[PDB]
Structure 1
Amino acid sequence: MESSKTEQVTGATGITQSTVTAPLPEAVSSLSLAPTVNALDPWVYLNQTEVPGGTFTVSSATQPGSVLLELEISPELNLYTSHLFRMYAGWSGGFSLKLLVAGNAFSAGKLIAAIIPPNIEVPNSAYLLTGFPHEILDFRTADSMEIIAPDIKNIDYHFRGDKLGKLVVMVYSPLRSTSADFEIEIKLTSAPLPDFKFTMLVPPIQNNALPIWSIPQAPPYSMVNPRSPLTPVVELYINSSYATCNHQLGRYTIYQGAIGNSTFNPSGAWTATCTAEAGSVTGHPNWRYALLDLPDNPTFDPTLPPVPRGFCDWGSGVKSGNKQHLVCFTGKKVEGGFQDVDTHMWDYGDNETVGLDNTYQRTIYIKDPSLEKDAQYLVIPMGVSGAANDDTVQVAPNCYGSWDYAPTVAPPLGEQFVWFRSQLPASKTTTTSGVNSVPVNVNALMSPDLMCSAYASGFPLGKVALLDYVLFGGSVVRQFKLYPEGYMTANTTGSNTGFIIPADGYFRFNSWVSPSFMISSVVDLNL
């Protein structure tokens, strides 16, 4: 609206158009209540930089009414104002947003962008989006559109934590083309408007998310496996069958740290004790009941977890009488320690009854005919024995009550989880030792070591991290998405249950993307 410029393409088979528009007038604050007004380096106003989570692709499949992009107008748009904002208490002013469109004269379709005031819901149809102040582009001639996005507020200047307006981009008319694999690419860049200002210098220690996250180059094999300490991580894994995870040990979150029953020192908390309560259950051998000790939950209330912190979540099976069991060290407690430590078979709760068969509680099986009454015993989970395989260990027992356990999660459609494997050694016995375990592999959703760095540099709100995985000195690079909930996903096309990736390491940070972002790189599982 403010101005328009047209240029002829090379060869004179079309044109490109550059426009500047101000759909909503800007009201400039007088800043009369600001104790001090702090100016910016003048060169910051002249430097367009890419906006985090400001990229998307339009294909013939994309339908109108789906929100492709939604961003708040704040200092986080620009790379340098984001870094500067850590030294200040408040801010005021708008931004100039530039849409870059890679169009062509032999395509068809339209695009719409609009400004949403604060405290207004975003609609899900291009028809309603025309109610807002907006602008429309055509793929045949669009080259770059500059939007003078205003800073809508009812106060003199902003403190941290307010509600802010948004920019929304949507397809107005579907894309068409003779070629079946043509697609339009959209990118956003921003810079503060000349009237942008800061106020009230303060020491630079804030809770914001750093615009750039620095990841130490520690490789995966140098990281611990939460669900199987004492065994190093050997490779990364992708399985098509594993469409969900219900584990409670390898769960970490950006906001509230550990989740469910997880801990930051898996090796330290791997040990527990039981009291060997009376009672027994039937079987060809004789099985015994024991109640786990809860030092952190001395009074067995339903609010706190019912099992020792970070204890164990193998998962034996829905029903396995003489087929599958868990094997652990066990020894009677005496002064100064324990005596006669040897391998025994065990499991969770009773067998026949439901709700106690495979669940978290204090009740556990013991394969000890000579289990002394009301005496304390040691428990080192070790591994599994019988007919157990990888699948049985993968599925953890269910959780019940009101002790805010870790919720089950699934990947977005079209993506698959990435795991940390570990070879669990097999234990064999020739004499009458009692038990014989079998080889098996254990997977963990996430390791605390990787998430440790992320805590120092939090994630920007409503964004995920796109990471590069360098293996052969840069020749081979893989792309993963790291969600705040604490899992990694990859884009796949094939179907395989045994895909292996080396553990050379060197994780690298690429950029911030939306949760619905589609990874450009694709991992072919059929190979």
Structure 2
Amino acid sequence: PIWQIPPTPPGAMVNPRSPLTPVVDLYINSSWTTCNHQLGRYTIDGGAIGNSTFNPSGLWTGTFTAESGSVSGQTNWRIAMLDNPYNPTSDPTLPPVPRGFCDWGSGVKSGARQHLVCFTGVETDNGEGYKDVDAHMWDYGDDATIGLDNTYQRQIYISDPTALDSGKRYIIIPMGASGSATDDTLQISPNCYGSWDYAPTIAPPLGEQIVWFRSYLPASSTSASSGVNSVSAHISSLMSPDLIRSAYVSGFPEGKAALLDYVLYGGSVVEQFKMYREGYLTANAGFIIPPDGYFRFNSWVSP
């Protein structure tokens, strides 16, 4: 059977790995030959694999709990634990972090490049909301041990001149990166170890590259206290859920990829993409591609 794709431009699609920032370009990079991401992972048969969702914006904000302490050496990095409502009992067969939570990489061992939970605040002590939400720096684990630097687990630290209220719950809305955060450091994601069924690290077919649905992330700095040196960057994804939603009506034939026509202006320039059942859409043999264009189905091809 044939596949019908609605003519929705990528500019009208959600960036699953970074909501609140629309898709600006389709990005091709020759130095990116893998994808160890946990957000934006979709499959034809398995649905939303890994830790992704079909509602990226809804599952974007999290909560954590203070741990009444600080990391060894650095007094400002108060330790804290991510709260998981989806996995209340700590089952080793289920993901530790809440579904849809951010997975931007920060580096192996770098006390110069920290993330930015642009909005973190304590509860109101009344159960109605939160209070004094402002920009703060965060990262996964403690940046000391091998198993807690890139671990994508529930332990984090928050940079704050004062001390967090012990045992009190806080909100988390990850928006921004600070320090020496380049685009390549955000493209990598923290390693996940354990038993739970996480998404594998995919690689493109031999000789082909990947379209990334890039977006521009602005800065959110502070001009007081110790200060926040946030920087502007870019974020990439595997594919938006909007494109792959249509494919579930008639799944791909057994061991068959699809040929997609990306048409920009009338019939002047029409690029060819090859979409696989594992989630990624490959091109061939990079440069940015405008988002004002629609995807059209050509035929079914063999890998």
TM-score, with length taken from structure 2: 0.96
Q: 1:340 and 1:434 mapped to 2: Cα distance?
A: 17
1:269 is the counterpart of 2:59: yes
1:330 is the counterpart of 2:120: yes
Q: Tell whether the 8 Å contact from 2:43 to 2:278 is kept in structure 1 after alignment.
A: yes
Q: 2:262 and 2:208 mapped to 1: Cα distance?
A: 17
Query: Are the structure 2 counterparts of residues 279 and 285 from structure 1 closer, same or farther at C-alpha, using a change threshold of 3 Å?
Result: closer
Say which of 185, 197, 202 aligns to 1:392: 185
Q: Tell whether the 8 Å contact from 1:343 to 1:434 is kept in structure 2 after alignment.
A: no
1:351 is the counterpart of 2:143: yes
1:285 offset after TM fit, Å? Answer: 5.0
- Could you tell me which residue of structure 2 aligns to residue 461 of structure 1? 254
Q: 1:332 and 1:431 mapped to 2: Cα distance?
A: 20
Query: Are the structure 2 counterparts of residues 507 and 464 from structure 1 closer, same or farther at C-alpha, using a change threshold of 3 Å?
Result: same
1:404 is the counterpart of 2:193: no
Q: Tell whether the 8 Å contact from 1:330 to 1:342 is kept in structure 2 after alignment.
A: yes
Q: Tell whether the 8 Å contact from 2:38 to 2:51 is kept in structure 1 after alignment.
A: yes
Q: Deviations over 1:36-64 (max 9, x none)?
A: xxxxxxxxxxxxxxxxxxxxxxxxxxxxx
- Could you tell me which residue of structure 2 aligns to residue 445 of structure 1? 238
Of structures 1 and 2, the one scoring higher in RCO (CA 8 A, sep 6+) is 2
Structure 1 vs Structure 2 CA RMSD: 1.2
1:426 is the counterpart of 2:223: no
- Could you tell me which residue of structure 2 aligns to residue 379 of structure 1? 172
Say which of 312, 320, 342 aligns to 2:134: 342
Q: Deviations over 1:278-305 (max 9, x none)?
A: 3321345521111111111111010011
Q: Deviations over 1:221-280 (max 9, x none)?
A: 000000110000011011010010000001000112101110111101000001111332
Q: Secondary structure at the match of 1:454?
A: helix
Q: Deviations over 1:287-325 (max 9, x none)?
A: 11111111111110100110011101100001111x100
Say which of 433, 436, 446 aligns to 2:229: 436
Q: Deviations over 1:416-455 (max 9, x none)?
A: 0111011111123334483231100000011000011111
Moved more, 433-442 or 237-246: 433-442
Q: Secondary structure at the match of 2:283?
A: strand
TM-score, with length taken from structure 1: 0.56
Query: Are the structure 2 counterparts of residues 433 and 382 from structure 1 closer, same or farther at C-alpha, using a change threshold of 3 Å?
Result: farther
1:514 is the counterpart of 2:302: yes
**Letter aligned with residue 397 of structure 1:** P
Q: Tell whether the 8 Å contact from 2:135 to 2:221 is kept in structure 1 after alignment.
A: no
Q: Deviations over 1:185-216 (max 9, x none)?
A: xxxxxxxxxxxxxxxxxxxxxxxxxx110100
Q: Tell whether the 8 Å contact from 1:254 to 1:484 is kept in structure 2 after alignment.
A: yes
Task: From the two aligned structures, give the one with the greater strand fraction.
Answer: 1
Q: Tell whether the 8 Å contact from 1:344 to 1:434 is kept in structure 2 after alignment.
A: no
Identity %: 73
Count residues with an aligned counterpart.
299
Q: Deviations over 1:350-405 (max 9, x none)?
A: 11101111111110011123211011000111011001100000000001111110
**Letter aligned with residue 484 of structure 1:** R
Q: 1:347 and 1:431 mapped to 2: Cα distance?
A: 21
Q: 1:242 and 1:427 mapped to 2: Cα distance?
A: 27
Q: 2:279 and 2:80 mapped to 1: Cα distance?
A: 34
Q: Deviations over 1:466-517 (max 9, x none)?
A: 101001211101111111110010112xxx5xx11111121000000112xx
1:456 offset after TM fit, Å? Answer: 1.7
Gaps of 5+ in 2: none
Say which of 187, 195, 216 aligns to 2:6: 216
**Letter aligned with residue 270 of structure 2:** V
Q: Secondary structure at the match of 2:231?
A: coil
Q: Secondary structure at the match of 1:484?
A: coil
Query: Are the structure 2 counterparts of residues 457 and 236 from structure 1 closer, same or farther at C-alpha, using a change threshold of 3 Å?
Result: same
Q: Tell whether the 8 Å contact from 2:68 to 2:165 is kept in structure 1 after alignment.
A: no
Say which of 152, 159, 165 aligns to 1:367: 159
**Letter aligned with residue 292 of structure 1:** L
Q: 1:351 and 1:225 mapped to 2: Cα distance?
A: 28
**Letter aligned with residue 504 of structure 1:** D
Q: Tell whether the 8 Å contact from 2:135 to 2:222 is kept in structure 1 after alignment.
A: no
- Could you tell me which residue of structure 1 aligns to residue 292 of structure 2? 504
Gaps of 5+ in 1: 1-210, 516-527
Q: Describe how 1:27-42 pairs up with structure 2 within 5 A.
A: none
Q: Tell whether the 8 Å contact from 2:136 to 2:158 is kept in structure 1 after alignment.
A: yes
- Could you tell me which residue of structure 2 aligns to residue 6 of structure 1? none
Q: Tell whether the 8 Å contact from 1:276 to 1:374 is kept in structure 2 after alignment.
A: yes
Q: Secondary structure at the match of 1:268?
A: coil
